[PDB]
């Protein structure tokens, strides 16, 4: 099975930007082959075909070029829609099979987050469980160092980070740091804490509540 | 032009048999091109699996061969994929697609689960803002997804309308179960004001919850 070489693995281009996405054959494929976008968590779309085809409603900032083992996609006077994955497949000979992917960002200048904090709901306490959970949004690079905190005792137990890929709106990342514990433990505390550390701060980021409260 | 519309059970057991259904409507599958099967595994990789061309004609990837099978149907005008003997390995979100002047068009895809693990169905809960922190310009609410399987849920925030400043984070995974939440941020003349609800499905279960976010006590 012939493997498609695709390069580079993710890029940062600014706006306006213009990339070229080499994919380079095994073999000699004789321009059997197609470019696909997948834009977040939906469907692709083939944006060439037989190596150097526009596809039908492809706007013409997209084009691509090749012969025999080596192809490349280049879009020009790129948008924040531009900024998603990119995968070529070659269907000469069989089976087919796709190259490896090329994610693309915007390049963006750094961001502290906007921190939120969130006790448990009155309906999850009731249901036996509590989570308190915390939002850190829109910033940049996505490297973030969070931080939990109950009555001061720092807290590695009962959390979970999620992060999301980069908003094309607004170039920035968000992550999502949950703590789950029991309600009689959470009925048990008083402070609650949540320190997000960026390479943009000197000193974290603190939200915190009291229970009491 | 044509749709491509691939409907199927979403949750397998292992050993058991992966069976799919991809709907052509807009064009005759005996007409032309040929029909597909590809998956995509988390971290996007993508598999191609096989196809069916407009004159029945098979052909598989060989990594699949003893276990592929891709027939049709041309009075309804539909393809199926049929997968044998899956193993937790064969997850992976399920696409048909046209071939031949490249891959033209696409069908919205299909998260294919392959466990022994129980459907549960998600219990939703409203995240406030902080207790008496009363804000100004801006006001962050929240929305969290507990308990629930296998992959697949929608969180919309009432409908669609609060869709710009909406941030909902991929879900993880702990224990056979899937916890995820978003985050909404609006103005404030807009809340309390307007009924802002967290609007979730859940097709395994049909468990289409709305929650109010309303403040505490």
């Known amino acids: 099975d012939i493997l498609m070489t695709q390069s580079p693995s993710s890029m940062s281009v600014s706006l306006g930007d213009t990339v070229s996405i080499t994919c380079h054959a095994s073999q000699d494929i004789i321009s059997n082959i197609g470019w696909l976008q997948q834009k977040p968590g939906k469907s692709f779309a083939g944006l060439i075909y037989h190596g150097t085809n526009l596809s039908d409603g492809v706007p013409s900032r997209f084009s691509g070029s090749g012969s025999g083992a080596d ?20 269907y000469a000979q069989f089976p087919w099979t796709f190259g490896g992917g090329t994610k693309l960002e915007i390049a963006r200048a750094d961001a502290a987050p906007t921190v ?98 | 032009d044509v749709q491509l519309q691939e409907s199927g059970p979403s949750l397998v057991k292992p050993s058991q048999s992966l069976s799919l259904t991809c709907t052509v409507t807009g064009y005759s599958i005996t007409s032309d091109f040929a029909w597909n099967w590809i998956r995509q595994f988390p971290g996007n990789k993508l598999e191609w699996m096989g196809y069916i061309s407009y004159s029945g004609n098979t052909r598989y990837n060989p990594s699949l061969k003893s276990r592929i099978s891709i027939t049709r149907d041309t009075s309804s005008n539909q393809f199926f994929l049929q997968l044998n003997s899956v193993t937790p390995e064969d997850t992976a979100t399920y696409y048909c697609a046209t071939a031949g002047r490249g891959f033209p068009y696409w069908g919205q895809g299909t998260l294919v689960t392959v466990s022994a693990a129980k459907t549960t169905p998600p219990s939703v809960y409203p995240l406030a803002p902080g207790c008496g922190d009363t804000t100004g310009s801006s006001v962050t609410l929240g929305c969290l997804v507990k308990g629930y399987f296998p992959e697949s849920v929608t969180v919309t925030w009432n409908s669609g309308s609060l869709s710009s400043s909406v941030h909902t984070f991929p879900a993880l995974l702990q224990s056979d179960l899937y916890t995820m939440s978003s985050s909404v941020t609006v103005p404030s003349s807009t809340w309390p004001s307007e009924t802002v609800t967290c609007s979730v499905a859940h097709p395994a279960s049909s468990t289409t919850v709305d929650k109010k976010l309303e403040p505490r006590a």
């Not at chain 1, 959970?133 to 807290?155: A, H, M, Q, T």
């Not at chain 1, 959470?186 to 943009?200: F, G, L, P, Q, V």
């Open chain 1, 116 to 213: 939120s904090i969130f006790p448990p709901s009155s309906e999850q306490l009731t249901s036996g469980g509590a989570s308190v959970v915390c939002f850190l949004n829109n910033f940049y690079p996505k490297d973030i160092n969070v931080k939990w905190k109950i009555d001061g005792s720092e807290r590695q137990n009962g959390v979970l980070n999620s992060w999301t890929d980069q908003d094309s709106k607004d170039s920035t990342y968000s992550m999502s740091s949950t703590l789950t514990l029991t309600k009689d433990e959470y009925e048990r505390h008083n402070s609650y804490t949540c320190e997000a550390t960026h390479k943009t701060s000197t000193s974290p980021i603190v939200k915190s509540f009291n229970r009491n409260e």
């Open chain 1, 71 to 90: 192809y490349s996609l280049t879009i020009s006077s790129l948008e924040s829609e531009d900024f998603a994955d990119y995968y070529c497949v070659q």
